[PDB]
Design a protein around this ligand. Structure first.
Ligand SMILES: CCCCCCCCCCCCCCCCCC(=O)OC[C@H](COP(=O)([O-])OCC(O)COP(=O)([O-])OC[C@@H](COC(=O)CCCCCCCCCCCCCCCCC)OC(=O)CCCCCCCCCCCCCCCCC)OC(=O)CCCCCCCCCCCCCCCCC
Ligand SMILES: COC1=C(OC)C(=O)C(C/C=C(/C)CC/C=C(/C)CC/C=C(/C)CC/C=C(\C)CC/C=C(\C)CC/C=C(\C)CC/C=C(/C)CC/C=C(/C)CC/C=C(/C)CCC=C(C)C)=C(C)C1=O
Ligand SMILES: COC1=C(OC)C(=O)C(C/C=C(/C)CC/C=C(/C)CC/C=C(/C)CC/C=C(\C)CC/C=C(\C)CC/C=C(\C)CC/C=C(/C)CC/C=C(/C)CC/C=C(/C)CCC=C(C)C)=C(C)C1=O
Ligand SMILES: CCCCCCCCCCCCCCCCC[C@@H](O)O[C@H](CO[C@H](O)CCCCCCCCCCCCCCC)COP(=O)(O)OCC[N+](C)(C)C
Ligand SMILES: CCCCCCCCCCCCCCCCC[C@@H](O)O[C@H](CO[C@H](O)CCCCCCCCCCCCCCC)COP(=O)(O)OCC[N+](C)(C)C
Ligand SMILES: CCCCCCCC/C=C\CCCCCCCC(=O)OC[C@H](COP(=O)(O)OCCN)OC(=O)CCCCCCC/C=C\CCCCCCCC
Ligand SMILES: CCCCCCCC/C=C\CCCCCCCC(=O)OC[C@H](COP(=O)(O)OCCN)OC(=O)CCCCCCC/C=C\CCCCCCCC
Ligand SMILES: CCCCCCCC/C=C\CCCCCCCC(=O)OC[C@H](COP(=O)(O)OCCN)OC(=O)CCCCCCC/C=C\CCCCCCCC
Ligand SMILES: CCCCCCCC/C=C\CCCCCCCC(=O)O[C@H](COC(=O)CCCCCCC/C=C/CCCCCCCC)COP(=O)(O)OCCN
Ligand SMILES: CCCCCCCCCCC1=C(C)C(=O)C(OC)=C(OC)C1=O
Ligand code: SF4
Ligand code: SF4
Ligand code: SF4
Lengths: 115, 318, 156, 96, 176, 171, 70, 215
């Protein structure tokens, strides 16, 4: 109840700031003013053209490495178990596999960007 | 009465943010053998008010090629999230007490980057697109390392409750136990706030203005205050995490003063770092975070899992 | 009347805010821009007056034309002047900008930037000293202080 | 040495004719130093010197509040200096 | 004779290797840079309080133009047109005729300040010290037309700045 | 009509209210708009012409349009969906009076609603632009330079000869 | 100055003083002046609900001592 | 653009952020100086060379003066030549300060610019004291220099020179051994000696590749 009210208050303040920004000052909008900016000149092509990503492999690896965080965050509660040996073994095993995956991608030139 | 507390949180934060810009300008000026703003009001104390009044009486423009809905949405989301990040911070009592405060701040910080992405894409300009892609690369660079550092540091706290960090550091600062991670953590915050040497999403010397190149007047001002509020919030979170202030239940003002002083020191350190160093290349930041920070972070995560079990020092409150 | 007093006070507030926060575009052409660099250098420190360079035209208030404007460059200068949100001002600095100067009779030089954009202040010199340009900036501040937009609107 | 600099600040406050003069000079020039008076204009500008400052800050002018026809309490400019004090103020000579 | 800027090798002993590893892991040179900026923080800034303080100039400084007079009040200019001939920017326009008393004086003397390059060649060419570049530099205008000086404007500038101009010429004329 | 006019921009901006209100669906109004450059050149030529001293001129465009067709063409050039509906005269007058209360420049007025819905007069006895050596510019040649500003990003690059010149009631 | 940077910093500090302090005072004003109760788990919430039920005024912070056991 | 020096239109073909093609478009500051010189006398044509390379003014003056003196078959007096070399080295200091500090500004190091432009201002004071103009001196002319040094100028030049080394040291502290600066500058824009010779390079652009040449 309090969190919803706080979120609503913050969003309302930001929206009111936008409304004041757009309704208080004097607007003189013409074609040349609202054109795109390319530092002196009209752009040759569109900005919606494909834009190559040289770190795509790292981007895919980030998806798999992010779920390791999901698997690892319950560790503070897992440390309160009675069979600490099994829990420590499993946590170390998971981290060792994460490090091994990182090492495998590193040695196979997977962290280098495309040319 | 709860709305009174919400306002008493949000308004001083904005006021602090406005004055932060003045402090940032004067500190850089004096480290550059000049003075910075000293004309508009005594010691430049009226400069932020003049800046805000100028920005909000200036005409905002809608780019012809822009997508208007996302263009208006992005600054609103940025400012609202920057304000929302402050509610779980215990100083020494939080406005919102959460069992999982750290995870909430993590998720909100993760959502905050979409303001940059959507503004850059909806501007429909080339430099804005380059800035948005640099933001994508930056998040990919720092996210995993930052999260694992948080987990390793909080393994000695016992939970994800932020206020418990006050109890964990009753006698000694957590930095004295985790100064390696702390160092890495600090750099990650620099990467998380898009601050020098990692101010790539803006990149003034390379991308003119980056993602916000098409923004003017009020939306640009909102992006600015969101960024500075994020700076202050991250430094406050770092101060609570690693520099534990002593809290006396019958006099919380002492904790408030100590916390504010430590936060100010860390923010001034950010300004100093901006004043001192050149700028990274945005592939070099990825290589730094993935080839140096990630292996050390993994090893120290193993170490900080093993240490409480080795020394029989597991914290309470499962 | 009360309305006249209120609009006068609001004019004062807006004029003070606009002249106390002047953000010139990062825009220079020739030798004169070098003196502009000396106007931001620690000796003069234009930032202490609230004057900050910003690269984006959308986030700039003043255009300082520091250098020779050529025919090849005129459409670009006009374009980045038009993309500046209003209210906006133009400061013409140096002889070339003011009237062509040493290259007035050239086949490729615009004889003064006022043929392309309206000009508020003209700063003479080849180049004007950093102090001369600072004097021009303060004169522009005074000219802004003399503005009466809301009074004019009220008397309409 | 902290007490010395605080006493110097108090001396600067007191040497401007009290608190009101201190605030007047602070809001008219953003500067509160005290220097040896060199001379005054027929228009009311006062000229002060302090040889212990570094080159550029060792000579300064407090402008008048009323020149020929306008009020210069806030609107001052460097064109209000007469040619003789212009030569002195710009260090083209060492003689007032 | 020459020297090498980047031809030094690092020693491979355990002392130097451990020092370099400590430099890598604990960021010592970055702390050195921070210390340099912190040292600059506590220094006295070089900013002056313009317009209440001014940057230093010289008697040779070339500022706004002025037309001068003899101590009797007679104009020094004799319409020889040397300044017009020497002007690299063709900023000077002169027309002359005999005065009512038969004296060689100008009727038109214009200087286009937006054509002027402020080189000082005109006062070098003048044989009677009639035209000079004065000490003034704070004469910005609001319209272009105000920077197109005629004879009256330049004579007024001379009458207004003669006290400083004569002193500067007295201080500088033995080098010319 | 021109870049800074209140004629094409007025109808183009009326898209912000969803539907286009037209008295009698704009089927009983005829308009003969004229280009801005044509009017300015006519003024200049009247200044320079010696026989135009005490004359009275009527500056009109080459074509006459029914208001409905003109507004439909305006929306077509702007590539905006045209949703015309009829509004009673009293209701539109009430709307104009409601908009008249703005202390700033009114969005519309009762006088504007009146003037929009009157047929342009025909005065063949008066000299026109052709008597000052000017050939009147058709609306179909200059409508894009005003209405391209009102398009979305998807239609900004559409050519001028794309949008099917409107039908004219020319005598 | 360098001490001329201090005023703005001071203002900053003042602003950052307000939120936390405010929260503390508000917590004392709406909870009987005794440091608003924390309920992280179900047991503490059950204690709070029992206190609210037995207070007699539908407010958990109204505490009844041994004077209520006749 | 902040990094385009105002009048450069670099048309770049990029694949992502990888630069596939650079096409420099110049002439945005083409003023037709060479055609304008043909209507001026030699003295009248001298001040154009001040505005050619407006970071190194007296060096262009000296080059033009040397060319005209060679064509005239005359010799400047020795004191004029010594003054020329002194002010040429002062001009070299100005040019290298501007180059290094703006380079660091483009990379991202903005602080050394402000430290070194105070020294640049002091050298501008030297220029003004010798000629009356801060940058466009027109001091060096075919046959020597226009005016002799005012009394006390050499002492002030000595005072500046005995302290400038510490400013160089502070800049070197901030940049030389920093790992970020090295990561941004090492192995960037590598050019071979033969390519540098064939492409028409000169100055540091040659000497950085090991070519031992200096005019
Ligand atoms: C059931 C109905 C669903 C309700 C949807 C919510 C309302 C949004 C729809 C209205 C906006 C479009 C109006 C428009 O076209 O231009 C306006 C108008 C027309 O401009 P124009 O140049 O003449 O022509 C524009 C062109 O048509 C082309 O212009 P364009 O390219 O900009 O058009 C794109 C637009 C056009 O929209 C459409 O095509 C149709 C609308 C259907 C969209 C719904 C799809 C579902 C998406 C996910 C669910 C959203 C929430 C649904 C739940 C609602 C209940 C709360 O599509 C959108 O962007 C809509 C996105 C709304 C989602 C906002 C949520 C923020 C996410 C933040 C993170 C989330 C955190 C976790 C929680 O321009 C203006 O007036 C200025 C700006 C006005 C818009 C400001 C912001 C938009 C409204 C706020 C969003 C609602 C959040 C609450
Ligand atoms: C190397 O050069 C540079 C600098 O050095 C000279 C800079 O400083 C610098 C930083 C930018 C500065 C110009 C600071 C700009 C200051 C802001 C834009 C002003 C924003 C302040 C307001 C919008 C905040 C809200 C104002 C209110 C008064 C707060 C209270 C809120 C109410 C609801 C109450 C940059 C980017 C730079 O590049
Ligand atoms: C050419 O002249 C004109 C202008 O000048 C340039 C204008 O600005 C102007 C107004 C500018 C528009 C963008 C205003 C549109 C805003 C409307 C009031 C929105 C319609 C009603 C809203 C409140 C949306 C909600 C709808 C219902 C819930 C009610 C008009 C109409 C105009 O004609
Ligand atoms: C800091 C955070 C909290 C802020 C709290 C205040 C929030 C304010 C929100 C922003 C509004 C202030 C900005 C401007 C003042 C309001 C006027 C404007 O917004 O609306 C006008 C409203 O006008 C409308 O177009 C038509 C006028 C009447 C509308 C009909 C509604 C019913 C009125 C019938 C009369 C009877 C009185 C009804 C009231 C009881 C349109 O003006 P417009 O020209 O477009 O835009 C240019 C604005 N200029 C002139 C200031 C430069
Ligand atoms: C509350 C939230 C909504 C509103 C947000 C605004 C918050 C309040 C704004 C604070 C205003 C303070 C500005 C006043 C500073 C002026 C200082 C003084 O110098 O001004 C002089 C004269 O003052 C100005 O003429 C008038 C400025 C103030 C205007 C009147 C006050 C109006 C207040 C109305 C508030 C209503 C807000 C909106 C309510 C919805 C001009 O001097 P100047 O030439 O520069 O300096 C020369 C420089 N030298 C000295 C170095 C040589
Ligand atoms: C987050 C920090 C900032 C938050 C925003 C709060 C700002 C509060 C201060 C407001 C200062 C007053 C604003 C006045 C400027 C308004 C824009 C403007 O200049 O319009 C001038 C315009 C000129 O029009 P014309 O002369 O007819 O035509 C000329 C063109 N052909 O005149 C007007 O329209 C005047 C309109 C009255 C302004 C109403 C302001 C009242 C106060 C509202 C403040 C809101 C605070 C919340
Ligand atoms: C005061 C008058 C109020 C009028 C309201 C009308 C709103 C509107 O669309 O008008 C357009 C208006 C100004 O354009 P013009 O009309 O051309 O300029 C005015 C002068 N001619 O544009 C705007 O500023 C729109 C502002 C948006 C309003 C707020 C609603 C947005 C809601 C976003 C919610 C999503 C936030 C995401 C965060 C949530 C996640 C936790
Ligand atoms: C944006 C995403 C919303 C996420 C909200 C997270 C807030 C949060 O975690 O607070 C937790 C808080 C308390 O939980 P504990 O920590 O366990 O403590 C109680 C035990 N003593 O949980 C709550 O209060 C639940 C309240 C309801 C959840 C809020 C739902 C908000 C979801 C987004 C809706 C946005 C509006 C819809 C439109 C979408 C965009 C157009
Ligand atoms: C008995 C068993 C005990 C357990 C073992 C514990 C011992 C641990 C010892 C090692 C700890 C090392 C911690 C450092 C973590 C990362 C450091 C690092 O090596 O990274 C650097 C890079 O780090 C940086 O250079 C940082 C760049 C950005 C600098 C930003 C500003 C500098 C920081 C200012 C001060 C920081 C203050 C931190 C604390 C703040 C308060 C919380 C390597 O990069 P390169 O030199 O390029 O070489 C890579 C190829 N080999
Ligand atoms: C923040 C430090 C001050 C920067 C001043 C920006 C001046 C913008 C002018 C552009 C420009 C730059 C950058 C520049 O570097 C340069 O030298 C080659 C010019 O020629 C004079 C220029 O015109
Ligand atoms: S006016 Fe003189 S200094 Fe300025 S750009 Fe032109 S030639 Fe260079
Ligand atoms: S200073 Fe040079 S350009 Fe100016 S008028 Fe004299 S000779 Fe001509
Ligand atoms: S100013 Fe001197 S050089 Fe020029 S015409 Fe007069 S006397 Fe001759």
């Amino acid at each position: 109840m309090n969190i919803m009210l706080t979120l609503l208050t913050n969003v309302t303040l930001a929206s009111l700031l936008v409304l004041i920004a757009f309704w208080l000052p004097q607007l003189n909008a013409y074609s040349e003013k609202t054109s795109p900016y390319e530092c002196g000149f009209d752009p040759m092509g569109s900005a919606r053209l494909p834009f190559s990503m040289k770190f795509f492999l790292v981007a895919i690896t980030f998806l798999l490495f992010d779920l390791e965080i999901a698997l690892l965050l319950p560790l503070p509660w897992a440390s309160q178990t009675n069979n600490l040996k099994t829990m420590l073994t499993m946590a170390l095993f998971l981290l060792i596999l994460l490090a091994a995956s990182l090492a495998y991608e590193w040695t196979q030139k997977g962290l280098e960007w495309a040319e | 009465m709860f709305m009174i507390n919400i306002l008493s949180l949000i308004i001083p934060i904005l006021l602090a943010v406005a004055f932060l810009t003045l402090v940032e300008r004067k500190v850089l000026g004096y480290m550059q053998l000049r003075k910075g703003p000293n004309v508009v009001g005594p010691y430049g104390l009226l400069q932020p008010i003049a800046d805000a009044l100028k920005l909000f009486t200036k005409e905002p423009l809608r780019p012809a090629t822009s997508s208007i809905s996302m263009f208006i949405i992005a600054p609103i989301l940025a400012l609202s999230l920057a304000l929302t990040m402050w509610v779980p911070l215990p100083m020494p009592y939080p406005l919102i007490n959460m069992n999982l405060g750290v995870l909430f701040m993590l998720a909100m910080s993760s959502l905050a980057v979409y303001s940059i992405l959507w503004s850059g894409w909806a501007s429909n300009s080339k430099y804005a697109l380059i800035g948005a892609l640099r933001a994508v690369a930056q998040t990919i660079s720092y996210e995993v390392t930052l999260a694992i550092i948080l987990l390793s540091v909080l393994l000695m706290n016992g939970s994800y409750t932020l206020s418990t960090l006050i109890t964990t550091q009753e006698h000694i600062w957590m930095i004295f136990t985790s100064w390696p991670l702390a160092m890495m953590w600090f750099i990650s915050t620099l990467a998380e706030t898009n601050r020098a040497p990692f101010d790539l999403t803006e990149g003034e010397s390379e991308l003119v203005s980056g993602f916000n190149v098409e923004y003017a007047a009020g939306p640009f001002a909102m992006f600015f205050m969101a960024e500075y509020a994020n700076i202050i919030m991250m430094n406050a979170f770092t101060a609570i995490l690693f520099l534990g202030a002593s809290h006396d239940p019958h006099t919380p003002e002492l904790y408030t003063i100590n916390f504010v002083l430590k936060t100010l020191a860390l923010t001034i350190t950010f300004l100093w770092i901006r004043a001192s160093y050149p700028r990274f290349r945005y592939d070099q930041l990825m290589h730094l975070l993935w080839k140096s920070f990630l292996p050390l972070t993994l090893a120290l995560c193993m170490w900080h899992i093993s240490l409480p079990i080795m020394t029989a020092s597991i914290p309470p409150q499962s | 009347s009360r309305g006249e007093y209120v609009v006068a006070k609001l004019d004062d507030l807006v004029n003070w805010a606009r002249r106390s926060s002047l953000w010139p575009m990062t825009f220079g052409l020739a030798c004169c821009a070098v003196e502009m660099m000396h106007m931001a250098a620690p000796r003069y420190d234009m930032d202490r007056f609230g004057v900050v360079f910003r690269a984006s035209p959308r986030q700039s208030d003043v255009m300082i034309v520091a250098g020779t404007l050529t025919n090849k460059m005129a459409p670009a200068l006009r374009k980045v002047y038009d993309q500046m949100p209003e209210p906006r001002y133009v400061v013409s600095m140096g002889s070339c900008a003011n009237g062509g100067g040493y290259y007035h009779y050239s086949y490729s030089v615009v004889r003064g930037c006022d043929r392309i954009v309206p000009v508020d202040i003209y700063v003479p010199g080849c180049p004007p000293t950093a102090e001369a340009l600072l004097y021009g900036i303060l004169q522009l501040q005074r000219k802004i202080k003399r503005e009466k937009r809301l009074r004019i609107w009220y008397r309409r | 040495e902290l007490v010395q600099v605080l006493r110097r600040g108090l001396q600067q406050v007191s040497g401007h004719g009290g608190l009101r003069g201190y605030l007047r000079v602070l809001f008219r020039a953003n500067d509160v130093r005290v220097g040896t008076l060199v001379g005054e204009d027929k228009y009311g500008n006062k000229y002060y010197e302090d040889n212990k400052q570094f080159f550029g800050r060792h000579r300064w002018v407090i402008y008048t509040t009323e020149m020929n026809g306008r009020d210069t309490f806030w609107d001052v400019d460097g064109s209000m200096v007469p040619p003789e004090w212009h030569r002195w103020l710009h260090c083209m000579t060492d003689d007032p | 004779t020459y020297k090498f800027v980047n031809m030094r090798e690092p020693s491979m002993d355990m002392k130097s290797v451990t020092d370099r590893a400590a430099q890598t892991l604990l960021w010592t040179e970055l702390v050195r840079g921070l210390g340099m900026t912190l040292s600059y923080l506590f220094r006295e800034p070089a900013t002056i309080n313009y317009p209440f303080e001014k940057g230093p100039l010289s008697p040779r400084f070339r500022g706004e133009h002025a037309l001068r007079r003899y101590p009797s009040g007679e104009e020094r200019c004799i319409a020889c047109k040397l300044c017009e001939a020497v002007c690299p920017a063709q900023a000077i326009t002169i027309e002359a005729e005999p005065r009512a008393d038969g004296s060689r004086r100008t009727t038109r003397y214009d200087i286009d300040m937006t054509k002027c390059i402020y080189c000082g060649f005109c006062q070098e060419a003048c044989p009677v010290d009639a035209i000079v570049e004065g000490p003034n530099f704070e004469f910005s205008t609001e319209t272009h037309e105000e920077l197109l000086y005629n004879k009256e404007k330049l004579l007024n500038n001379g009458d207004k700045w003669e006290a400083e101009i004569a002193a500067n010429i007295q201080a500088d004329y033995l080098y010319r | 009509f021109g870049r800074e006019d209140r004629f094409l921009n007025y109808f183009a901006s009326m898209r912000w209210f969803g539907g286009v209100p037209l008295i009698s669906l704009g089927k009983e109004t005829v308009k003969q708009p004229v280009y801005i450059v044509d009017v300015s050149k006519g003024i200049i030529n009247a200044i320079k012409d010696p026989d135009a001293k005490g004359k009275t001129f009527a500056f009109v465009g080459p074509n006459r349009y029914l208001l409905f067709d003109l507004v439909q063409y305006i929306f077509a050039v702007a590539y905006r969906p045209f949703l015309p509906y009829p509004l009673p005269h009293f209701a539109y007058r009430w709307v104009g009076r409601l908009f008249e209360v703005s202390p700033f420049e009114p969005w519309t007025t009762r006088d504007k609603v009146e003037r929009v819905h009157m047929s342009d007069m025909t005065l063949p006895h008066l000299p026109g632009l052709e008597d000052l050596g000017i050939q009147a510019t058709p609306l179909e040649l200059k409508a894009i330079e005003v209405l391209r500003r009102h398009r979305t990003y998807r239609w900004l690059t559409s050519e001028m000869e794309d949008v099917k010149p409107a039908k004219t009631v020319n005598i | 100055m360098w001490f001329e940077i201090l005023p703005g910093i001071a203002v900053m500090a003042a602003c950052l003083f307000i939120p936390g302090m405010a929260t503390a005072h508000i917590h004392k004003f709406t909870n009987g002046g005794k440091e608003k109760r924390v309920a992280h788990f179900s047991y503490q919430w059950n204690l709070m609900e029992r206190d609210r039920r037995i207070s007699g005024v539908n407010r958990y912070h109204v505490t009844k001592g041994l004077e209520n056991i006749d | 653009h902040p990094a385009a020096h105002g009048v450069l239109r670099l048309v770049m073909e990029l694949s992502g952020e990888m630069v596939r093609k650079c096409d420099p478009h110049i002439g945005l500051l083409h003023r037709g100086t060479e055609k304008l010189i043909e209507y001026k006398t030699y003295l009248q044509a001298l001040p154009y060379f001040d505005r050619l390379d407006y970071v190194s003014m007296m060096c262009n003056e000296q080059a033009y003066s040397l060319a005209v003196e060679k064509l005239l078959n005359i010799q400047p007096p020795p004191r004029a030549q010594w003054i020329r070399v002194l002010f040429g080295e002062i001009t070299r200091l100005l040019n290298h300060i501007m180059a290094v500090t703006t380079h660091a500004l483009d990379i991202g190091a903005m602080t050394p610019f402000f430290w070194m432009f105070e020294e640049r201002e002091k050298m501008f004071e030297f220029y003004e004291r010798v000629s009356g103009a801060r940058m466009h001196a027109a001091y060096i002319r075919p046959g020597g220099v226009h005016q002799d040094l005012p009394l006390g100028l050499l002492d002030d030049i000595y005072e500046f020179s005995k302290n400038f080394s510490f400013r160089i040291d502070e800049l070197e502290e901030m940049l030389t051994n920093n790992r970020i600066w090295r990561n941004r500058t090492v192995d960037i824009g590598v050019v071979t000696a033969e390519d540098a010779l064939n492409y028409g390079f000169s100055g540091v652009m040659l000497r950085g590749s090991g070519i031992q040449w200096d005019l």
